[PDB]
């Protein structure tokens, strides 16, 4: 209600400046409520960022669940694309959420929990490919999955933030798919 207005305001202002340059007053005004009324919905502007991150992460996670319930290069591209499209459609929340991992235990634990879930799912699919005889038994599945997932995190987020260096955003999906498919099917 007013909660959604606070979240939308925060996402809107995060496109213009860091969380340190947004005050509870900024969020309050944007949602058409007083400052004390803000504190009824959220204990802090940091709790607003945590909720936004939690929604984007859960949106990615549900999209990956949807794929899982329904050629091999395209299978991997469709999974990587969940993360490219989801985080890529919420760049300001991605950037601020990643920056808050340094200062918020709750942001670090949220990120850590979902990365563990996505790595376990990556490993399970590599194992299924190995059991069906399509992928060779090279590295331990979970170790290969961990490095591929951490590559995606750093490479996607560097591209979205226009970092130097970074893969251009128009080339990053193809770049990651090549490295996943060659490292999973290669010996």
Ligand X SMILES: CCOC(=O)Cc1nc(-c2ccc(C(=O)NCCC(F)(F)F)cc2)cs1
Find all residues with CB under 8 Å of 111, minimum gap 6, and list them.
Answer: 53, 57, 97, 98, 101
Radius of gyration of the chain (CA): 19
- Nearest-5° angle of CA 124, CA 129, CA 134? 165
Site string for a copy of itself, 83-112 (x = CB under 8 A): ----------------x--x---------x
Among a copy of itself, ligand X, none, the one that 138 touches (CB under a kind-dependent 5 to 8 A) is: a copy of itself
Q: Which is nearer to ligand X, 9 or 122 (CB)?
A: 122
Site for ligand X in 35-94 (CB under 6 A): 67-68, 75-76, 78-80, 83, 87
- Interatomic CA distance for residues 23 and 19, integer angstroms: 8
Site for a copy of itself in 114-173 (CB under 8 A): 115-116, 119, 138-140, 143-144, 146-151, 153-155, 158, 163-168, 171-172
In this structure, the dihedral spanned by the alpha carbons of residues 115, 122, 70 and 135, taken in order and rounded to 10 degrees, is 170
- Interatomic CA distance for residues 175 and 187, integer angstroms: 19
DSSP element (H, E) containing 106: helix 105-131
Does 104 bind ligand X (CB under 6 A)? Our answer is: no
Site string for ligand X, 131-150 (x = CB under 6 A): ------------------x-
- Residues at the interface with a copy of itself (CB under 8 A): 99, 102, 112, 115-116, 119, 138-140, 143-144, 146-151, 153-155, 158, 163-168, 171-172, 174-176, 178-179, 182-183, 185-187
């Amino acid at each position: 209600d007013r909660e959604l207005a606070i979240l939308a305001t925060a996402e809107n202002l995060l496109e213009d400046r860091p969380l340190a340059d947004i005050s509870v007053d900024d969020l309050a005004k944007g949602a058409g409520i007083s400052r004390p009324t803000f504190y009824f919905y959220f204990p802090s502007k940091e709790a607003v960022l945590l909720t936004l991150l939690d929604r984007v992460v859960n949106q990615a996670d549900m999209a990956l669940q949807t794929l899982a319930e329904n050629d091999r290069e395209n299978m991997w591209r469709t999974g990587i694309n969940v993360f490219f499209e989801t985080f890529g459609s919420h760049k300001a929340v991605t950037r601020a959420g990643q920056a808050a991992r340094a200062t918020s235990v709750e942001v670090a634990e949220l990120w850590s929990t979902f990365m563990q879930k996505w790595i376990a799912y990556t490993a399970a699919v590599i194992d299924a490919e190995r059991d069906r005889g399509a992928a060779p038994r090279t590295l331990p599945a979970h170790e290969l999955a961990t490095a591929l997932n951490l590559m995606n995190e750093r490479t996607l987020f560097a591209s979205f933030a226009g970092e130097q260096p970074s893969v251009p955003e128009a080339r990053v999906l193809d770049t990651l798919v090549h490295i996943w498919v060659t490292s999973i099917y290669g010996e």
